[PDB]
């Protein structure tokens, strides 16, 4: 305890402690910082004779060399329990809402914990109805499993996440946790607050069943780096007691980018495109905690931001192996005014199994992929030679594929702000029936423009009849 | 009709060549950037 | 029993790497112990990699948050080793040989050192005994033999693990001991794999060596070498499986790209100079050490074999990347799985045009070798005429029937999951298809046809299957005895169904 | 002459020697192990104060930081002589075959030798007589020249190697050397040893006429780096006697790769795509000892593996900078029962000019590969026209092309005991005369399949008459 700061390189602070009182690897140290408020850093490395390198998790732009640092002796401890329900927290577990601080009697748990062992893993999963045609058909949202959407900058990751929360947050059957790691505080939060506080479940709002940890784009790298772990610690308590948890982490990428900035300031040898050497291990340590165990289940939905539009970037490439369901949003689809923007051929799911999801659902999904695979195989021929050169059955498959592309589009209840289309909730059964009817041949006479921004097939037929 | 179809196909092929040239140049710049970055990292 | 051990002091512990100060007379890959101290009742081992002047940079096989500056490390005299023997069959063990399924301790008597020299230059033998994958496409066009290392390379989600698990499940009675090394794979997926193996009763001869993503990069780095040592012991000493001294091992590295990532992490944390794509310079050496230990020893050295099935994911189907090209160079054959073929209904998704098996017909049964030549030729020729198929509609009747036969053969290979076909069944189906007995069947029903056909042979005539299996090693498989009672069975099935 | 190990990082060993007894830049370190054998390193960088950085040549998984090291003064010494014939060796010259060690009486030569001076080089290129029709016609070799096969497995490359060894051993004295650099131990060993031991000529196995040195992928980068030089020294011993030597450096590219790794672990600053800065010089020091002097000629036919299919890559480009001929083995020709899978096209040779081979040899070699210049492009037309029923004159060209494609095949002596057909050795003059007379039209009377496996046009005629 009672060290002194030696160097301040960015948000990385090197501090010298007594020889026999060096802080451990993940302990939390504190700069008094004056004014009655302190800066909580987290140790990352031990460099020698009492020298430790830590991450500020704060502004760290007004403190000098030689400032004293006090070693708490424990890692970051965040409140857990029902006291955290309906409250908004920092990475440090300190509430930022107007309500008072969490009481001392509330249990404090470290944000660094071992992930569930191999024994505790629960491999049982079942389909989770979400009301989105493309998600419930091509890449089913998995109950008790890990799923994520990989989208570029211009695609609607936020819109899809908000629609998912609106659809599945009223009938939770349990509590929920939302982590806003590296996301806009305009929409990513403070309007999810408006939507979550407005939604009511039998006189109890959805916000009353939600623990929200933020650490968004404005925060320094340390906060964005450890906010995910804080949210996981707050959700693991509810999972361990048996309560089902809906976990919504935002931009797991932003979690990885911060790790990259922290590693760059820490002097580690860079790997690939400036990323940290310990990318896979950090991703594993965060993600293996997001697991449904035999004591409780976590239904996790994540977002991932692809830099530029490169799906081969190390961060999404590392995420891809940690998911049960993958949903790929493409800019090319989005620029076609297909706001769901999901690419059916690049979106998969583990529970898309005839034993799990149903024989008819499986057959319909496989056919809806075989079509649009025939379309992707013929994109260049249509581009250069044109539609005429294809055979008759190839023309039919291409027409059905383009109709299917238009039909995957669907208005969202949270999209009324900039789109005039009222939102639509299509059950999985209706989606399967609509796509089976479309594949059979019903709707061939219908022009493709009538499949755009519609619900099930009955809505398309009604629109066609209205157009006569 | 064949003359018109081949004129349209040639125009489409020229447009596709322009798009592929843009993509190839982007890939070339990315490859040079990656090469110099890894060479500088190995030197340092 | 007091002994004197060499002790060093941890002077700098970081992201799984510790500088151990004075540990003189330490072997270049020993296991430093980190004896338990106040707050930790267990030992966290490490591998002393860099033996620099006045420093021992050691990667840590475990969680490094407990290790603190100034802690004493005792150098165990043993090089990194893994327990081996009969006791590991049916057990999930982390790369250190410690069970992680919690079914009890690992009963063992021998600990083989990982990172061993290759079995030998003249000690090997020609690969002749086939490995029956159970997938028609692999078993007919890209054969795998005992002692042949066959890469499974593909995109992120195309069926690589599915192919590996199908191969593991098929080795029920073929005297094979499977090993599944899961490198960097999420613990839930390893649990799913273990559940699949247990469901089909394939956990009486399988060893799962899992170093999941959360576990330190040192464990993932040594994950394949452990397990490869297990297979080395199996091929060199054998294990009692089903009352037989089995000396054949089939090791499947779940993802060698993740192993290369782990090696890159441990190298860059050791501050070793990078190379191409930030990987260390000797990563081709890394994988060549591991894969060249899979060999088919001659009868003088035991006659055992070790079959390796590395798995690689490629970003955007870029098989020109660094690690994919390295492992393609190392291996004896490649199985390319494509998302384009996977989505189009071709479930095994093998790109038979570019998939190659350098062992060739020597890794096939004489029946399969005799039958699959026509299959390969017709499939290649159909791929050649796909150009005319896409555009031309004025092709003559010969080319129409030719492309139709190609489609017949392609639809024959659309095998489902967890439904392996034994050698006799595949031989019968390929004989039926190649001898024009399947021409009248329309394409969408062929798979169903095949399935129904097998049920016929499983109910109407088991003796034809027994006859096919019994004399599958003869030089001329279409024996007049074999040729009859099989064409008769096919014709009988034709009348019964449609 | 005894130093102490200072650092051990992978396969790079730093060793401090006494001030006045520092080893030279390519000497051997020869670390002694406890169990009787020794670990022979190779110095790479003199530095500091008596400190030398060397490449391991071995595992280095049992070495401390105080072990003594005994400088050998000379570079890696390899046994050379008639004794080292029909035996398999590693990079260090230790026989890895079942038979016993090489006797002390056999001369040991340094692995590193100076390539022949400019004055000794031949002032005129000379064709190398192999006996294979397609090789001696389309892509003739060079005495003291380099040739690369671009072919996978199952195309008969091993049989081509065996026949080349047999032909050079029969027509000339023709001792042969085979350096498997970075090969699969399955393909390189026990599928080359057994095939060459089984293959026989004049009651003598091919393996009895061939030296083998094998640095496989499992060995450290230094071993794969210096196995080529070991084979060069063994071949150069016989070349000094005036005897012609045929050397097969299988996967010369794996040599380059090895050097790259040796540089990356040596701290050398990377060049181009991670490759070593000393790429051209390292390749020259190996490819310049393969030349035709006055006393004798070391003809080399190497194998090149290009990563992916990139000939722009620095390793294939550096290899091609030292190549005289390319032979392109193809799957399509091999699966058509054409035993020599050499593609008439995509197989070039700089000797194929009228100044060296001769005007007639060049003229016919241009007459052939011209009817196939289109690769019978008629085959595309036949596919959508059916030859328009028949071509005005093209149908003849198709017949001639099919006949010559069949005629490129030749019965090999090494396969004589497999297919039961005697091996045919065809001189280059016989090949040129046969192909010229076939192109004149003398070969328009015999049907196809009469050229299927016959050595000369005259041999085809004898068959037609009988
Ligand atoms: N017949 C089949 N053969 C192979 N794969 C199939 C088949 N039918 C479905 N699949 C798909 O294969 C999946 C099995 O996992 P797979 O082998 O594709 O994993 P992987 O290639 O290791 O990918 P990841 O990197 O995502 O773990 C199933 O969940 C399903 O999506
Ligand atoms: Mg896998």
CSV table of C-alpha atoms and ligand atoms in Angstrom, one decimal, chain A residues 349-350 362, chain C residues 156-162 313 342 347 415-417, ligand 1:
chain,number,residue,atom,x,y,z
A,349,UNK,CA,-27.5,-21.1,-36.2
A,350,UNK,CA,-26.8,-24.3,-34.3
A,362,UNK,CA,-35.7,-26.9,-41.3
C,156,UNK,CA,-16.0,-20.6,-40.4
C,157,UNK,CA,-19.1,-22.7,-40.5
C,158,UNK,CA,-19.1,-25.4,-43.2
C,159,UNK,CA,-19.0,-28.8,-41.5
C,160,UNK,CA,-15.4,-29.3,-40.5
C,161,UNK,CA,-16.2,-30.4,-36.9
C,162,UNK,CA,-19.1,-32.4,-38.3
C,313,UNK,CA,-10.8,-22.1,-40.8
C,342,UNK,CA,-22.9,-26.2,-48.2
C,347,UNK,CA,-24.2,-31.2,-47.1
C,415,UNK,CA,-25.1,-37.6,-46.9
C,416,UNK,CA,-26.9,-36.4,-43.7
C,417,UNK,CA,-25.2,-35.8,-40.3
E,1,LIG,N1,-25.0,-33.1,-43.1
E,1,LIG,C1,-24.3,-32.1,-42.5
E,1,LIG,N2,-23.0,-32.2,-42.6
E,1,LIG,C2,-22.2,-31.3,-42.1
E,1,LIG,N3,-22.6,-30.2,-41.4
E,1,LIG,C3,-23.9,-30.1,-41.4
E,1,LIG,C4,-24.8,-31.0,-41.9
E,1,LIG,N4,-26.1,-30.6,-41.6
E,1,LIG,C5,-26.0,-29.5,-41.0
E,1,LIG,N5,-24.7,-29.1,-40.8
E,1,LIG,C6,-24.2,-27.9,-40.1
E,1,LIG,O1,-22.9,-28.2,-39.5
E,1,LIG,C7,-22.9,-27.7,-38.1
E,1,LIG,C8,-22.0,-28.5,-37.3
E,1,LIG,O2,-20.8,-27.6,-37.0
E,1,LIG,P1,-19.6,-27.5,-38.0
E,1,LIG,O3,-19.0,-28.8,-38.3
E,1,LIG,O4,-20.2,-26.7,-39.2
E,1,LIG,O5,-18.6,-26.5,-37.3
E,1,LIG,P2,-17.3,-25.8,-37.6
E,1,LIG,O6,-16.9,-25.9,-39.0
E,1,LIG,O7,-16.2,-26.3,-36.6
E,1,LIG,O8,-17.6,-24.3,-37.2
E,1,LIG,P3,-17.4,-23.3,-36.0
E,1,LIG,O9,-16.1,-22.5,-36.3
E,1,LIG,O10,-18.6,-22.4,-36.1
E,1,LIG,O11,-17.4,-24.0,-34.7
E,1,LIG,C9,-24.4,-27.8,-37.7
E,1,LIG,O12,-24.7,-27.0,-36.6
E,1,LIG,C10,-25.1,-27.4,-39.0
E,1,LIG,O13,-25.2,-26.0,-39.0
